[PDB]
Design a binder for this molecule. Sequence first.
Ligand SMILES: OC[C@H]1O[C@H](O[C@H]2[C@H](O)[C@@H](O)[C@@H](O)O[C@@H]2CO)[C@H](O)[C@@H](O)[C@@H]1O
Length: 377
Amino acid sequence: LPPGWEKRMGSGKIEEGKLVIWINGDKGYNGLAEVGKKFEKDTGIKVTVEHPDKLEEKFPQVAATGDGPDIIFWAHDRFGGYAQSGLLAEITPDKAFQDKLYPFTWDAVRYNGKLIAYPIAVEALSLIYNKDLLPNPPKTWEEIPALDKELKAKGKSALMFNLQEPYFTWPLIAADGGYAFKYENGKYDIKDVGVDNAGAKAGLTFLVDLIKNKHMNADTDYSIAEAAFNKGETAMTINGPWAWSNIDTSKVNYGVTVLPTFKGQPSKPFVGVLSAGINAASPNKELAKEFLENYLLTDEGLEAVNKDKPLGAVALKSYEEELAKDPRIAATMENAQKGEIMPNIPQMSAFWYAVRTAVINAASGRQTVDEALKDAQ
Ligand SMILES: OC[C@H]1O[C@H](O[C@H]2[C@H](O)[C@@H](O)[C@@H](O)O[C@@H]2CO)[C@H](O)[C@@H](O)[C@@H]1O
């Protein structure tokens, strides 16, 4: 199980009197660092924002040995698993603080009756399109192939998104009836990975058909997708609010809109709530609580992070109402509403690993759409 246990053995594990915060590379870590500086000026407490690669997997490795950051940022879906491993301190906001956030966001970070993290923003994938190449985006997945060959004559592609992470292809898979775990009447039934049904099958086959007919390459990743769109080579892409910042600086005239339908049914992106949890091994819990409640989760705090990279629909009511006017955010919520909030059950990491492989192989010439979808059942 453990990696890197030997190195840190005698090094003072999590430093006292300091704050170490981890957050994914695609998020506004400089904006967060600004809140840190505001925190440093008021308290003398030094804040250090880092963005390690493979964050979602590096944290459970180091935290299991009493290591890592005081504060861990990630979508809520992996927090129940962190909680079951005893990596998270329980958080104690009072009622007056909880009322400042949307109740549905606290539910996303509630595991076994306990609040295990602070909600920050609601994330959902949307269709992002180049208006100069495509003033009106297609409403259906089915009209993409015809659109793509049309654009091919001009040396442009129709659609390019990250095919390595199942997060980006999940809304296709779930549009017709695919699902992770049955949620019947309050609690999830793990004994039916609904990733096997016809609805799921029909979704991935189309993606596989899109690569069979050369409309998409199966080796396309986040960096390749972002580059093709931001330079102006592809007309559409699929991404979250965090990506808007790099697109903004590329001067592609872009719009953010509802994901394409499939079989007359909307794509259902897996909705993620960006959350901040406190390491169980942190000797700075009160400092972390003070930082999170009175510095980050304020209008000034969220604005700083947002200006760097858009968080989407923030969990804090007061700062939200100022953002709702942004149609890109409206589009995010529209897609979120058509999708479903990810569960936080510990099985999710297992789910994600399976589907990921189940998607890569089926999209490639290594396994079929069943030697991958049964391989993940
Ligand atoms: O691809 C599986 C992956 O999906 C989600 O990860 C998202 C994350 O929520 C977003 O904030 C953004 O960083 O894109 C990620 C996909 O690369 C799940 O949250 C994650 O647990 C899961 O592994």
